[PDB]
Design a protein around this ligand. Structure first.
Ligand SMILES: Nc1ncnc2c1ncn2[C@@H]1O[C@H](COP(=O)(O)OP(=O)(O)NP(=O)(O)O)[C@@H](O)[C@H]1O
Ligand SMILES: Nc1ncnc2c1ncn2[C@@H]1O[C@H](COP(=O)(O)OP(=O)(O)NP(=O)(O)O)[C@@H](O)[C@H]1O
Ligand SMILES: [Mg+2]
Ligand SMILES: [Mg+2]
Ligand SMILES: [Mg+2]
Ligand SMILES: [Mg+2]
Ligand SMILES: [Mg+2]
Ligand SMILES: [Mg+2]
Ligand SMILES: [Mg+2]
Ligand SMILES: [Mg+2]
Ligand SMILES: [Mg+2]
Ligand SMILES: [Mg+2]
Ligand SMILES: [Mg+2]
Ligand SMILES: [Mg+2]
Ligand SMILES: [Mg+2]
Ligand SMILES: [Mg+2]
Ligand SMILES: [Mg+2]
Ligand SMILES: [Mg+2]
Ligand SMILES: [Mg+2]
Ligand SMILES: [Mg+2]
Ligand SMILES: [Mg+2]
Ligand SMILES: [Mg+2]
Ligand SMILES: [Mg+2]
Ligand SMILES: [Mg+2]
Ligand SMILES: [Mg+2]
Ligand SMILES: [Mg+2]
Ligand SMILES: [Mg+2]
Ligand SMILES: [Mg+2]
Ligand SMILES: [Mg+2]
Ligand SMILES: [Mg+2]
Ligand SMILES: [Mg+2]
Ligand SMILES: [Mg+2]
Ligand SMILES: [Mg+2]
Ligand SMILES: [Mg+2]
Ligand SMILES: [Mg+2]
Ligand SMILES: [Mg+2]
Ligand SMILES: [Mg+2]
Ligand SMILES: [Mg+2]
Ligand SMILES: [Mg+2]
Ligand SMILES: [Mg+2]
Ligand SMILES: [Mg+2]
Ligand SMILES: [Mg+2]
Ligand SMILES: [Mg+2]
Ligand SMILES: [Mg+2]
Ligand SMILES: [Mg+2]
Ligand SMILES: [Mg+2]
Ligand SMILES: [Mg+2]
Ligand SMILES: [Mg+2]
Ligand SMILES: [Mg+2]
Ligand SMILES: [Mg+2]
Ligand SMILES: [Mg+2]
Ligand SMILES: [Mg+2]
Ligand SMILES: [Mg+2]
Ligand SMILES: [Mg+2]
Ligand SMILES: [Mg+2]
Ligand SMILES: [Mg+2]
Ligand SMILES: [Mg+2]
Ligand SMILES: [Mg+2]
Ligand SMILES: [Mg+2]
Ligand SMILES: [Mg+2]
Ligand SMILES: [Mg+2]
Ligand SMILES: [Mg+2]
Ligand SMILES: [Mg+2]
Ligand SMILES: [Mg+2]
Ligand SMILES: [Mg+2]
Ligand SMILES: [Mg+2]
Ligand SMILES: [Zn+2]
Lengths: 547, 76, 49
RNA sequence: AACAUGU
RNA sequence: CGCGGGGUGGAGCAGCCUGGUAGCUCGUCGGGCUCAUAACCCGAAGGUCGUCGGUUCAAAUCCGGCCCCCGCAACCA
RNA sequence: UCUGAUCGUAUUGGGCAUCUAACCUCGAACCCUGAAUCGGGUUUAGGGACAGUGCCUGGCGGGUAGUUUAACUGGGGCGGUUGCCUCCUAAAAUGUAACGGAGGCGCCCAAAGGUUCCCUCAACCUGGACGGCAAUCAGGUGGCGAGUGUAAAUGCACAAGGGAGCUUGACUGCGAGACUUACAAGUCAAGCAGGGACGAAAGUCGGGAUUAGUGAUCCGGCACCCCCGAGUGGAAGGGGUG
RNA sequence: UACUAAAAACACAGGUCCGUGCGAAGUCGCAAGACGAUGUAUACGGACUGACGCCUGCCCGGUGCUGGAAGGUUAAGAGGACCCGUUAACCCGCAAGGGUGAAGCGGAGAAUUUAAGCCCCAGUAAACGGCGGUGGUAACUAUAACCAUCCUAAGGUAGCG
RNA sequence: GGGAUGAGCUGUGGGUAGGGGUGAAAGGCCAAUCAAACUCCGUGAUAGCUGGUUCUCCCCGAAAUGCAUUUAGGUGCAGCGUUGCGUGGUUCACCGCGGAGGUAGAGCUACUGGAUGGCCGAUGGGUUACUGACGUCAGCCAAACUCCGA
RNA sequence: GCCGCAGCGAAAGCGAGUCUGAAUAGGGCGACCCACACGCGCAUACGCGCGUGUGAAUAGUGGCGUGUUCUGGACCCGAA
RNA sequence: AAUAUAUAGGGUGCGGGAGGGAACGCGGGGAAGUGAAACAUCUCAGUACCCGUAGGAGGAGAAAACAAUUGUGAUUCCGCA
């Protein structure tokens, strides 16, 4: 069994925060590895070593011969051409210009000399039979109907958040590399597309590495589980219910070993201050053991966790949002048609729908950044909102994380109260000298965490959150949903995490469109578990993508 | 036995005027080694990095006042 | 916090200069315009990895 | 399963 | 004298080398329960962080300067 | 013939069980043996591919062996200190000791470096929405009492201090001649050439207003140059410059 | 303690704990052998108290000793993908060079497989060891039987001073 | 003065050997020697430490400081002695001229601090019999104060 | 055989030069006779280049002495 | 012999060995003081000492050797390098 990727004595560290230290492991074809770990462990930095983007400090992390590699970054890039032209840049990347050379020589060789160009239309034709590119048009027309892509002739600027991930999954799954590097593939996707990607990654010739924070995508695609602790990597097999056992066990034995090391210090620190008696001397061997036990008691300080704390706004009145017969559409396609609801006070409203159906356009009519076609939105004089788009200003990639929350100022207003800015970003995890990290080097778990710092400093009593459960681990995801239950205003949450809307929701707004209407919604007074029961009282073959 | 924490000091840096006035020098000799510009460069004298007042031309050193600031010059 | 970095030419890939940056202030690679003795003219130098 | 006291 | 801990609400202690938001138990104060007092339940008030002089945007914390309290060494003739 | 499951022969290792023939027996009897609680042999009764021993290998190891365990010091110990920068001691050049008197340093800055151009501060006084001793504004007076990334001295208002434009000289090949110095080191340097930055030019720039922010030699690592290449062509390893 | 120390030191009879199932454990030996003992757990050896009388409290966190074997970590041996050196041949060519390179022999060798130990989970103090602070409170005063709080593996009981 | 039928005292012959013996345990004893016996050999061990080192005259003539040191009672290089060969007044004294200085002294409304007594009086304390800032008129002080200055 | 006979360079090598360097730039190390007429683009006089000298001033090596040094017990005596 | 073939052991007759010597030789075992201004690698040194075994000498000795592509042609020992 010849491998695909190997690492030998690899050590990568960003100064004090080590990512690897003397790791050595091999990736053989047919592996289905799901890599886990908390935020700051280094999961996206390992996959950029394996993609050839980054390089380790020392050690030899190389690749097998042949064996091309495709990576999905955690924020995937796109071009500025069409959707049909967005898929040909990967998977059909090098093979379209062989097709764009063979049709060139179909008229250039006729009007020119036919002896050197005879073989130039020959060795192209030898690269169209083993790769089978004679029907390259309909190979694109299949790989768009598998991921259910948006149509061919539209720009990639006015797309969804999940439609920009459906078009980026189609780039890598056409290349068919011998080593996938999926960095959070199930972000922004609905339940239909994640169920698709489970059955596609089952039958797949090649190694699959996939860093995920959820627990149900991993148990269907991964049988081996790799972990990233503070530097070390701990490979074993399981199904992520045994990951949370073994992670909580390493900290159990470490807690009552650092505690036993602590009582050895206080019995020894009492010796070094005891003062030397008559002419016998205090032993320099025991002074040297104390000065080396004090150093190993300082490279173990790991407890630093602050709860997410949402600021309370002013007192909220009886009318929060009123919507009377709302219509919204960008073309002849209609998204919202005859919608009437009224947002409650002191609840959580979950918004349900598949990709490209108008959940984010629904928020932009409430904040006023869009305009209703017919019908009105009414807010009410006590309501102060809190909302920031993902696209209109967002973050700036070379301002530091302290001057994005602040604007270079010392103290900030989080709503009729004065708090320091460095005491505010440190309440959101960014502590110590990590407050000078610019926005480009922030990871996905601390770009979602930065985005909560910008929205919640507006001090509102109606917070609108568009997918807060995006790149957060289970320690702080439970800390966020704790703070949405101690919140005395109305919170509206768009999500696709089915086991996050089942936990903290009191009202459900869901798309129940079918073939004749395609644009109707539904308001439900109750939680998500009771909406599934009420759904069945009112009221598939896997698409292949290749051949 | 109240051991004072007041013992240390730095090595002397051999500062001062190293060639005096009316004295024949070669091109490039050091005239005044000093901290800051206690003496200023006059004619045919350059300052240097640590204010060392070298010579640009062989000749005779002469000192003088030029609008308050005391200067060092070389008469070729 | 101030590591020592080596700057390499972007044409012939010789490592001509060593210097120090700040890793928190400049997380990305340093591009300067230094003089390569191999090429004989000032050319774009960039850090190594 | 609760339950001490009385110028 | 010399070392090296310590001073935080009325009493006891966290927080401190990991600078930003002063906390925990009892006690005090007002209301309940009881025939009444306890116990228990509810709501509150209370601190120049020993004093004063330095860095920082910001000090109970970091660093000096003094004032008390506690512990330990003072061995060989 | 591919991916996966399954069956079958041949082969080859790992456990477990049984066997006896290597090996083991201070169980027994007989013989050399005339005198033998030694030893060897024969047969028997048991153990058995284990144990024991060889070579390789991890652990454990004051049981034993060889040794180390600094100096200054108002005797030694205890306490303190050890290199580097700044001032007083220092007796008007330099230098100068003490467990003499005060502080710092083991960095920081991709501009807080280079260049061209422009500007002057603190404090005080009068007027002014929130505005207070003091935010920002306007006008008087003000020659250095502010400021200098960082201790202190020497300096700096002509600014080396406050602001803006473009940039990488925080260079490569050298360096006559000097300061300091036991040696080893440490420090300054006009100017010539390549190739650049800024400036209309003259010109200035081999990092920072200056002096602290560091470590000899050996042995190794890396990139580059293709210098030697143990019969010859290669390579191993050495060599040069960074 | 011949030769400045005859005692309160050592021994002792009694006590307990641990080791030993039999050419035993322990000891002298490189080994054969020997002692133990021509003895066989009421015997033999090692440790610590020291007739007798009344007694011998609490602590298993530390460090040992005994047992366990889930998990981590871990040697040689087995295994020998890939990579590098050399070159039959081939390709561009100036055959002054450059590139690709089978088989073979060598260099350096990864995944995988693998015991004790150590970390780990338990018991053990007649195992080496350890057995707390500050403040209030009663008929004049005084002292606290009593209470508050912090901490530990547990806070020095009987008796004595 | 203690034991003196007992764990007694003694004779003759025998066994245990040096990191070993033996020890009712004192580091005791092992040939007048024991925190590792004695004797030959390695061997003329080594000692930054102490002692000693022998005949004469003639010329010149020091040092006890600097830097470094597992260094401080030792040593290396310098400094100072002598001698061979080079150089020849370049050394030093005095007089004349050209130069930098911040001690002694003095000064401080020239700065940073200290500081006596008057006058004015911001604040603070009980309409103000106490506090007395900042200014101001005379008299002062300083190694880390200097407009000056031998 | 040794020392002298030519050096420079890490070394291939080149050689009264050679190494660094892009350098007919500068340096490092090494060679290199005016006190003397003439000839000598020459220069008021003085030298440069170059024949003849006015027939310039060099030099090493081996023996035996002496001073110090190296390896030996190394000036002699002395431990535990 | 036990035990059958037989061997261990036993009988008789012939030959030989043992131990000493001042040095030198060969093969095997193998220190420490000392030098490194301490010391462990290293040195002292395969020395001192010990064990086996000789000979008048001993060991080595007739190329599975060197060389550099021309050549020398068993070993020992002295001089150089
Ligand atoms: N500016 C626009 N012009 C035209 N069409 C648009 C625009 N913005 C969004 N759309 C389309 O409107 C539909 C829904 O938009 P959007 O609200 O962003 O869906 P969505 O809920 O965000 N999908 P998702 O959040 O990934 O689950 C998609 O088909 C978009 O392509
Ligand atoms: N270039 C950089 N310089 C300095 N620090 C960096 C740099 N890149 C990354 N980091 C830091 O190292 C961490 C490594 O990021 P990483 O953990 O790989 O992302 P992540 O694991 O995917 N986070 P998440 O996706 O939520 O799990 C970042 O969170 C930063 O704190
Ligand atoms: Mg990520
Ligand atoms: Mg969306
Ligand atoms: Mg000084
Ligand atoms: Mg400088
Ligand atoms: Mg920047
Ligand atoms: Mg009450
Ligand atoms: Mg005494
Ligand atoms: Mg074995
Ligand atoms: Mg020892
Ligand atoms: Mg020794
Ligand atoms: Mg001493
Ligand atoms: Mg003393
Ligand atoms: Mg002086
Ligand atoms: Mg003087
Ligand atoms: Mg200090
Ligand atoms: Mg600038
Ligand atoms: Mg400026
Ligand atoms: Mg630099
Ligand atoms: Mg020079
Ligand atoms: Mg130039
Ligand atoms: Mg120009
Ligand atoms: Mg210059
Ligand atoms: Mg500076
Ligand atoms: Mg060395
Ligand atoms: Mg060769
Ligand atoms: Mg090489
Ligand atoms: Mg060079
Ligand atoms: Mg006696
Ligand atoms: Mg006696
Ligand atoms: Mg006696
Ligand atoms: Mg007994
Ligand atoms: Mg027993
Ligand atoms: Mg035994
Ligand atoms: Mg015991
Ligand atoms: Mg006793
Ligand atoms: Mg236990
Ligand atoms: Mg055990
Ligand atoms: Mg017990
Ligand atoms: Mg008692
Ligand atoms: Mg008697
Ligand atoms: Mg008597
Ligand atoms: Mg008697
Ligand atoms: Mg005898
Ligand atoms: Mg004793
Ligand atoms: Mg004796
Ligand atoms: Mg001894
Ligand atoms: Mg000797
Ligand atoms: Mg001697
Ligand atoms: Mg004389
Ligand atoms: Mg000397
Ligand atoms: Mg004069
Ligand atoms: Mg004078
Ligand atoms: Mg002075
Ligand atoms: Mg004076
Ligand atoms: Mg004054
Ligand atoms: Mg006064
Ligand atoms: Mg003075
Ligand atoms: Mg040479
Ligand atoms: Mg030259
Ligand atoms: Mg013989
Ligand atoms: Mg030795
Ligand atoms: Mg020695
Ligand atoms: Mg010595
Ligand atoms: Mg022979
Ligand atoms: Zn280049």
């Amino acid at each position: 069994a010849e491998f695909i990727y190997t690492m030998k004595k690899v050590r990568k560290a960003h100064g004090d925060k080590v990512i690897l230290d003397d790791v050595t492991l091999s990736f053989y074809p047919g592996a289905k590895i799901g890599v886990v770990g908390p935020n700051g462990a280094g999961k996206s930095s390992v996959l950029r070593i394996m993609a050839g983007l980054d390089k380790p400090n020392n050690g030899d992390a190389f690749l097998a011969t042949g064996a091309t590699v495709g990576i999905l970054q955690q924020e995937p890039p796109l071009n500025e051409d069409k959707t049909v032209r967005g898929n040909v840049e990967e998977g059909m990347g090098d093979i379209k210009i062989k097709l764009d050379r063979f049709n060139e020589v179909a008229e250039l060789m006729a009007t020119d000399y036919t002896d050197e160009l005879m073989e130039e239309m020959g060795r192209l034709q030898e690269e169209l039979d083993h790769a089978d590119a004679w029907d390259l048009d309909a190979q694109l027309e299949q790989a768009m109907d598998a991921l259910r892509c948006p149509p061919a002739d539209e720009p990639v600027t006015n797309l969804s958040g999940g439609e920009r991930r459906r078009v980026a999954l189609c780039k890598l799954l056409l290349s068919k590399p011998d080593l996938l590097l999926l960095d959070e593939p199930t972000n922004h996707l609905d339940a239909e597309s994640v169920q698709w990607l489970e059955q596609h990654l089952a039958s797949y010739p090649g190694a699959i590495l996939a860093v995920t924070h959820d627990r149900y995508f991993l148990d269907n695609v991964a049988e081996w589980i790799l972990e990233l602790d503070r530097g070390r990597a701990y490979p074993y097999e399981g199904n992520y219910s045994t990951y949370l056992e073994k992670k909580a066990e390493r900290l159990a034995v470490q807690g009552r070993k650092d505690a036993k090391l602590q009582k050895r210090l206080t019995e020894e620190l009492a010796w070094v201050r005891s003062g030397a008696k008559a002419r016998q001397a205090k032993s320099k061997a025991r002074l040297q053991r104390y000065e080396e036990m004090a150093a190993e008691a300082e490279k173990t300080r790991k407890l630093d966790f602050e709860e997410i704390q949402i600021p309370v706004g002013p007192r909220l009145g009886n009318v929060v949002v009123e919507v009377d017969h709302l219509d919204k559409g960008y073309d002849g396609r209609a998204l919202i048609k005859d919608l009437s609801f009224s947002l409650p006070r002191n609840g959580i409203v979950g918004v349900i729908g598949p990709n490209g159906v108008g959940k984010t356009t629904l928020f932009k009519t409430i904040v006023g950044l869009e305009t209703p076609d017919s019908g009105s939105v009414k807010v009410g004089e006590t309501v102060k909102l809190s909302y920031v788009d993902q696209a209109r200003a967002g973050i700036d990639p070379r301002k530091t994380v302290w001057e994005v929350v602040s604007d270079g100022l010392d103290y900030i207003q989080v709503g009729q109260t004065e708090v320091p800015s460095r005491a505010y970003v440190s309440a959101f995890g960014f502590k110590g000298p990590d407050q000078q990290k610019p926005a480009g080097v922030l990871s996905g778990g601390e770009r979602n965490r930065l985005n909560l710092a910008l929205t919640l400093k507006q001090g509102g009593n109606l917070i609108l959150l568009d997918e807060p459960t995006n790149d957060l681990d289970v320690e702080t995801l439970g800390s966020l949903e704790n703070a949405l239950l101690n919140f005395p205003g109305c919170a509206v949450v768009i999500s696709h995490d089915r086991w996050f809307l089942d936990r903290t929701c009191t009202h459900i707004l869901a798309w129940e469109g079918d073939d004749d209407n395609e644009a109707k919604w539904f308001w439900f007074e109750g939680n998500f578990g009771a909406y599934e029961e009420n759904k069945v009282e009112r009221l598939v073959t896997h698409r292949k993508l290749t051949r | 036995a109240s051991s004072s924490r007041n013992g240390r000091d730095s090595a002397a840096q051999r500062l001062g005027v190293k060639r005096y006035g009316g004295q024949v020098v070669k091109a490039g000799e050091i005239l005044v080694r000093q901290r800051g510009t206690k003496f200023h460069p006059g004619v045919n004298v350059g300052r240097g990095g640590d204010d060392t007042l070298f010579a640009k031309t062989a000749g005779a050193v002469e000192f003088g006042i030029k609008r308050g600031r005391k200067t060092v010059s070389i008469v070729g | 916090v101030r590591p020592k970095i080596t700057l390499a030419c972007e044409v012939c890939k010789h490592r001509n200069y060593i210097t120090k940056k700040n890793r928190r202030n400049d997380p990305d690679r340093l591009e300067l315009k230094k003089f390569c003795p191999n090429c004989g003219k000032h050319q774009a130098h960039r850090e190594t990895r």
